Design a protein around this ligand. Structure first.
Ligand SMILES: Cc1cc2nc3c(=O)[nH]c(=O)nc-3n(C[C@H](O)[C@H](O)[C@H](O)COP(=O)(O)OP(=O)(O)OC[C@H]3O[C@@H](n4cnc5c(N)ncnc54)[C@H](O)[C@@H]3O)c2cc1C
Ligand SMILES: Nc1ccn([C@@H]2O[C@H](COP(=O)(O)OP(=O)(O)O)[C@@H](O)[C@H]2O)c(=O)n1
Ligand SMILES: [Mn+2]
Ligand SMILES: [Mn+2]
Length: 554
């Protein structure tokens, strides 16, 4: 049928400056040594990515898909959603959002300047009066930091990002923002992954595991997901949004955004040259996350039907998928999972890596993370979320004239506080750097799902206890897998071994305790693991006052 992209030959040119590594990395050169292994994806590689994601797609639906789709439009029909005011949409523009071709940017939009409000008024009117003219988009390479992997060909080529002008992005929010806050939950309920904190996500997976008589799990991820989304998929989501109770002015605009933007259109490089035509999902529109998650859920749940997965329990995060179900014996389980992949490939969601039944919760990795188990001092099993620390460490060492890694450090401390690598490596280096800079009580930003939250470093014991409980300060005995991976990745980046971080942490704890006050609380709670004779940690009164509800939602 249809090709995901077609190209003119104009290069995918860069969007501003692409930072150079510096000869000295002063904030992270005591964290790790192999800075040569830490790289940023660039627009140089956008053409290799463009080759990999360009392919003819043939999608064959069936009675299982059709049945799932009907059940989901019915669930959608219980949702009522309102237009956003143009002013409400403007105020949701992030402060550094790409400026507009029409002489204004995020600053003027968020301030409700008249020049911008006027322009966006006319963009909106044109949305309701013209249902068909394609909206131009810009294509840029994403810049993101990785560690080199010689197993996987060296350096990953840059992901492709496609977005329309800033005026249209505000209009998307008027039409569709309220649906993004309501649809995924109403359609998948507890299966919606972007509603769980790390501890809540572990609770959920453990609950699912324990109620199967004979549990079996697998994960799934689609190869180059946005390029596999077909024009029929994108119109099938217009009809899932339209299933809601909506004012007519929204319906018109949703239809027009679908036909003129979401189903495809022309792409321009940053020099204004025509770059190609797109017939798949543009990653950069407001509906990227909601479309990906709903379209993944319909296909995945359809394929489960097609393969006879029994009593499935799903957890869907974009195109990342976990299914825990009743095992039919290992021989049938392997057959079913082959059937699942075949169905998914027929629905145009072919796999990155072929899935495989597992019977141990630690062996299932999805959303870049997995469940692991540690004892305490009691011998009592405590379960937590963790991940390969390689990409976290690489981003910990990204240091340019324009980018500080310090926010990146805080983000992993909050999100993976119970892990051994956060406790022994990141926390130790974090507080070591801030004490020497004398910046312990200076606010940092925590970035999650678009939003930024203000965090004072000295409040981490309360924050961590509110998120992960007091067991995050007491994990005694980590798993063989977890010890092996953390030791491997430190070796892989030239960081000191865990024995060295234990020495450094004894020092950080001592200095923290000597400063008294809030710092000493950090020394005692965050570093209790490092002293021979453990203090008895008591619940922190501050933690009950904390509302972290919106931190891990959307
Ligand atoms: C709705 C949503 C909006 C986000 N907006 C921003 C932003 O504005 N600025 C910023 O710096 N970071 C943004 N992020 C990245 C976010 O903070 C997390 O880093 C992200 O969820 C990656 O999870 P992971 O690295 O642990 O594992 P991953 O495997 O990398 O991510 C898990 C799944 O979440 C989806 N996803 C991952 N990263 C993104 C992303 N940037 N945008 C959209 N979907 C993604 C994918 O479908 C992926 O399969 C966003 C993430 C989501 C889910
Ligand atoms: N930085 C990112 C990463 C993922 N995504 C979205 O999430 C989808 C799946 O992400 P992914 O990690 O599986 O990478 P691919 O499947 O695209 O190779 C993308 O195809 C994009 O639609 C995004 O919009 N921005
Ligand atoms: Mn994928
Ligand atoms: Mn993925």
């Amino acid at each position: 049928s249809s090709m995901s992209y077609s190209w003119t030959g104009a290069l995918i040119t860069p969007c501003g400056p692409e930072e150079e590594k510096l000869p000295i990395n002063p904030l992270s050169n005591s964290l790790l040594r192999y800075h040569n292994k830490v790289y940023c994806t660039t627009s140089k590689s956008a053409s290799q990515r463009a080759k990999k994601v360009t392919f003819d797609r043939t999608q064959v639906l069936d009675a299982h898909y059709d049945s799932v789709l009907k059940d989901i439009k019915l669930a959608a029909s219980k949702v009522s959603a309102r237009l956003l005011t143009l002013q409400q949409a403007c105020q949701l523009t992030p402060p550094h959002s790409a400026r507009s071709k029409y002489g204004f940017g995020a600053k003027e939009v968020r301030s409700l300047s008249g020049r911008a409000v006027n322009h966006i008024k006319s963009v909106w009117k044109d949305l309701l009066e013209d249902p068909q003219t394609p909206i131009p988009t810009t294509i840029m390479a994403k810049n993101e930091v990785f560690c080199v992997d010689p197993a996987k060909g060296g350096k990953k080529p840059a992901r492709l990002i496609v977005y329309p002008d800033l005026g249209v992005r505000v209009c998307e929010k008027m039409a569709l923002y309220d649906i993004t806050q309501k649809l995924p939950q109403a359609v998948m309920g507890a299966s919606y992954g972007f509603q769980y904190s790390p501890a809540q996500r572990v609770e959920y997976l453990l609950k699912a595991w324990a109620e199967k008589k004979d549990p079996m799990g697998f994960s799934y991820d689609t190869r180059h997901f946005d390029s596999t989304v077909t024009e029929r998929d994108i119109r099938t989501e217009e009809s899932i949004y339209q299933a809601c109770s909506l004012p007519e002015e929204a319906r018109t605009a949703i239809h027009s955004l679908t036909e003129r933007l979401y189903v495809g259109g022309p792409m321009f490089n940053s020099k204004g040259q025509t770059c190609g035509y797109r017939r798949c999902r543009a990653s950069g529109v407001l509906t990227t996350s909601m479309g990906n998650t709903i379209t993944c859920y319909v296909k995945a749940l359809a394929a489960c039907k097609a393969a006879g997965i029994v009593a499935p329990t799903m957890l869907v995060c974009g195109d990342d998928l976990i299914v825990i179900s009743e095992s039919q014996g290992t021989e049938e389980d392997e057959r079913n999972l082959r059937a699942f992949t075949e169905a998914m490939t027929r629905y145009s969601a072919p796999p990155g890596d072929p899935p495989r039944p597992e019977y141990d919760l630690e062996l299932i990795t999805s959303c870049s993370s997995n469940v692991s188990v540690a004892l305490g001092p009691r011998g009592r099993r405590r379960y937590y979320l963790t991940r390969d620390p390689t990409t976290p460490l690489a981003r910990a060492a990204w240091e340019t004239v324009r980018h500080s890694p310090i926010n990146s450090w805080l983000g992993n401390i909050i999100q993976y506080a119970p892990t051994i690598w956060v406790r022994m490596v990141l926390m130790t280096h974090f507080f070591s750097i801030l004490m020497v800079q004398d910046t312990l009580d200076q606010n940092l930003n925590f970035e999650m799902y678009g939003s930024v939250y203000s965090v004072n470093p000295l409040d981490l014991p309360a924050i961590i206890e509110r998120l992960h409980g007091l067991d995050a300060f007491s994990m005694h005995t980590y798993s063989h897998h977890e010890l092996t991976r953390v030791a491997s990745a430190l070796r892989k980046l030239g960081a000191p071994p865990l024995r060295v971080w234990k020495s450094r942490a004894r020092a950080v704890r001592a200095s923290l305790i000597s400063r008294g006050g809030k710092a000493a609380v950090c020394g005692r709670y965050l570093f209790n693991w490092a002293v021979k004779t453990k203090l008895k940690l008591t619940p922190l009164p501050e933690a009950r006052l904390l509302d972290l509800s919106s931190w891990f939602t959307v």
